[PDB]
């Protein structure tokens, strides 16, 4: 029951600072424009110890499956090859991605009826809000 409050189907309803976050990450112009237009559905499920997070959008469909605390290799939607670790810290799902000596952190937390996503790359933060679909 570790992630119970995250499980479900969620739809993007707002975004702030995402273009600048993507610039800091190193995403190129065309991908930023098209990805920034995306309105993904995020589908979170749990089966035993395995958490799956799917994202579906007109830009890309992705899927990750993982066990908390256990590193995995990930090709991200913007085509970075990263090493990812996802943990639960005080009820917040914390996703760290490492590649090319760089690091970014994506945190997901339940706040009221929303799932709030905070993405940080150096000093640049973006906040994305999802609601139940």
Ligand X SMILES: CC(C)[C@H](Sc1cc(Cl)c(Cl)cc1Cl)C(=O)O
Residue 20 binding ligand X, by CB under 6 A: no
Q: Which residues are annotated as a binding site?
A: 128-130
DSSP-assigned letter for residue 132: E
Residue 44 binding ligand X, by CB under 6 A: no
* Cβ-based nearer residue to ligand X, 16 or 49: 16
Token couple for 108: 């997901």
Q: Of the candidates 57, 103, 125, 127, which one interacts with ligand X according to CB under 6 A?
A: 57
> Is residue 46 left, alpha or beta, with left meaning phi > 0 and alpha meaning psi from -120 to 50?
beta
Decide: 54 and 43 in contact? Cβ < 8 Å: yes
Write out the residues near ligand X by the rule CB under 6 A.
Answer: 22, 25, 27, 35, 38, 40, 55, 57, 59-60, 62, 76-78, 104, 106, 117, 119, 128
């Amino acid at each position: 029951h570790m992630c119970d409050a995250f499980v479900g189907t969620w739809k993007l309803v707002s975004s702030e600072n995402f273009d600048d976050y993507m610039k800091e990450v190193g995403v190129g112009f065309a991908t930023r424009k098209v990805a920034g237009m995306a309105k993904p559905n995020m589908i979170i499920s749990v089966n035993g110890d395995v958490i799956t997070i799917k994202s579906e959008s007109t830009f890309k469909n992705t899927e990750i499956s993982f066990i908390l605390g256990q590193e995995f290799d990930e090709v991200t939607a913007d085509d970075r090859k990263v090493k990812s670790t996802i943990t639960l810290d005080g009820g917040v799902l914390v996703h760290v991605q490492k590649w090319d000596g760089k690091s970014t952190t994506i945190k997901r937390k339940r706040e009221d009826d929303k799932l709030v996503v905070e993405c940080v790359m150096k000093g640049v933060t973006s906040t994305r809000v999802y609601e139940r679909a």
